[PDB]
Write a protein that binds this DNA or RNA. Structure first.
Lengths: 57, 57
DNA sequence: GGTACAGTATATACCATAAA
DNA sequence: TTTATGGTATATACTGTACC
């Protein structure tokens, strides 16, 4: 299937990234392990963090 | 093949986008037709303009 | 009701580096 | 010399809309 970043999933992702101390500091694997979401791969998080990083700073 | 945005190709792409009056105004097809580069598809330009747009404004 | 396109989201491939 | 990872570049899929 193709992942959809629903506004909940994204809010999870953000809280995660904040805990990790901002988008720049945060790591894919780190975000992954904090979210603990069934079926979410590292590759899902990696791509999305890449966007999140650019649409921020 | 997989396209590589060599610093020349990119300089072409930019001049194009400028002629078209900035990244926001510019269109994939428009940039395409101004560059007139053998083997360059609209899909190449589309993706790259998407990046150019975010790493600018 | 089918193109052709723009805009956007997501995925995938590349490239370097560290650790073993 | 593999494996795992992060960063990054590029590609591919989705969604709407205008035109015909």
């Amino acid at each position: 299937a193709r992942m959809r970043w629903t506004p909940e999933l994204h809010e999870a992702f953000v809280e995660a990234v904040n805990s990790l101390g901002g988008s720049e500091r945060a790591t894919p694997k780190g975000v992954l392990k904090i979210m603990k979401v069934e079926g979410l791969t590292i590759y899902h998080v990696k791509s999305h963090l890449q966007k999140y990083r650019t649409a921020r700073y």
